[PDB]
């Protein structure tokens, strides 16, 4: 089971040094032809290769970033590390750990990717989200189906993860991309079920914010007169 797992500081002050770690399993970095390295994707942009280190201890660097990059590895502990010096806002990105294969034909390709770690370079302050349950309008002439909602405001930095009934309620979900407004993020999610499903059955918004380390559940209940 080939796995790549990125870990990073989540956010970082400008001018500081970013340290990224990638833990992997399902293969050894002693194996010939195998390398592990880094590719970053700035929000809503394309891909930029950063560096790779091989079983050889040979290490490839992106020429432009070369001066700012240091890649290393701990083979015995299945980890490779990347350091980026004097970080700037242009380093704000999701950083992917990827396995590289040195081809039988020569050449290279990235056959396994980690899920990524988001990094924000910001002076701004960390803030936990407020989570708000959104039940339908009182007295609404209910139709064949009902839409419930979940509002997540006032948090920083990205990311936030949101599920309904802890993933088990997966269908009919629309989780909307976060939007930054005044150094705070706002995210929302929609879920639609049949009128026979809700409020009959319990529906719960699950929201988690790593940077503040908060897990919050908000059950969606019909509005009272409050």
């Amino acid at each position: 089971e080939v796995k790549l797992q990125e870990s990073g500081p989540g956010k970082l002050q400008p001018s500081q040094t970013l340290s990224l770690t990638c833990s992997f399993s399902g293969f050894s970095l002693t194996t010939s032809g195998i390398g592990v390295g880094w590719i970053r994707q700035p929000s809503g942009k394309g891909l930029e290769w950063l560096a790779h280190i091989w079983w050889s201890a040979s290490k490839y660097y992106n020429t432009a970033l070369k001066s700012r990059l240091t890649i290393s590895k701990d083979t015995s502990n299945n980890q490779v590390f990347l350091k980026i010096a004097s970080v700037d806002t242009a380093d704000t990105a999701t950083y992917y750990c990827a396995r590289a294969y040195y081809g039988n034909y020569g050449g290279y390709y990235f056959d396994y990717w980690g899920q990524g770690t988001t990094l924000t370079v910001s002076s701004a302050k960390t803030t936990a989200p407020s989570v708000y349950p959104l039940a339908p309008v009182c007295g609404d002439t209910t139709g064949s189906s009902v839409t419930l909602g979940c509002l997540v405001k006032g948090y920083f930095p990205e990311p936030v993860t949101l599920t309904w009934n802890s993933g088990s309620l997966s269908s009919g979900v629309h989780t909307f991309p976060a939007v930054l407004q005044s150094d705070l993020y706002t995210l929302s999610s929609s879920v639609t079920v049949t009128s026979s499903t809700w409020p009959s059955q319990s529906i719960t918004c699950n929201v988690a914010h790593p940077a503040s380390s908060t897990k919050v559940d908000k059950k969606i209940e019909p509005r009272g007169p409050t």
Partner: protein, 218 residues
């Protein structure tokens, strides 16, 4: 170092039809026997996934409706028959020299029957009101095409400021789009007014779809 230009930037193709993506290299990227070009698929909220290596070699497990071709400076990814789950951004990258680089990507979207948005409005939760905030949310779900206008009206007069919107990426199962309008006021201002309305204008109808509630009324 090598630059790669993908085109088009964006592609909309009917179901079961053929989607074709091209990738120009600033210099040749192939020997007499192999071309060193790779293709990746990135679905929204996901890491890139390897489809094609060495121009035409399909990675293990990838559906045969994906195919790659080309050589030298020109390469092509083909998707036929295009399916709903294939909505994604597609990237090429070379392995001819360090630095490895990527193309800018091509967003492939499914073209489908027009559809009207399902519109739902939501007063501020009492929990938010308790803390002094008041957000009115409006969901416009499962419509097509992605272009849509949202208007907020408070007691008849339209409001534009304090709104922020966010679009879903094309749904991988029904190829629709959704979006979310949030009007944020203070509790103070919210209580001074009665009727709150979000109006959705969409090609699907000449008439906007409108949802309303009156504060503290039911």
């Amino acid at each position: 170092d090598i630059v790669m230009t993908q085109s088009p930037a964006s592609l909309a193709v009917s179901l079961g039809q053929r989607a074709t993506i091209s990738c120009r290299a600033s210099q040749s990227v192939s020997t007499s026997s192999y071309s060193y070009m790779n293709w990746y698929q990135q679905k929204p909220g996901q890491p890139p996934k390897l489809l094609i290596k060495y121009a035409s070699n399909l990675e293990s497990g990838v559906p045969a409706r994906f195919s790659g071709s080309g050589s030298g400076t020109d390469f092509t990814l083909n998707i036929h028959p295009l399916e709903e789950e294939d909505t994604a951004t597609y990237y090429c990258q070379h392995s001819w020299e360090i630095p490895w680089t990527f193309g800018g990507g091509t967003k492939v979207e499914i073209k489908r029957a027009d559809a009207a948005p399902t519109v739902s409005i939501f007063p501020p939760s009492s929990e938010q009101l308790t803390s002094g905030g008041a957000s009115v949310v409006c969901f416009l779900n499962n419509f097509y095409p992605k272009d849509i206008n949202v208007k907020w009206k408070i007691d008849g007069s339209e409001r534009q400021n304090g709104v922020l919107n966010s679009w879903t990426d094309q749904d991988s199962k029904d190829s629709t789009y959704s979006m979310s309008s949030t009007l944020t006021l203070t509790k103070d201002e919210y209580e001074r007014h009665n009727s709150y309305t979000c109006e959705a204008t969409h090609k699907t109808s000449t008439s906007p779809i409108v949802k309303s509630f009156n504060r503290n009324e039911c």
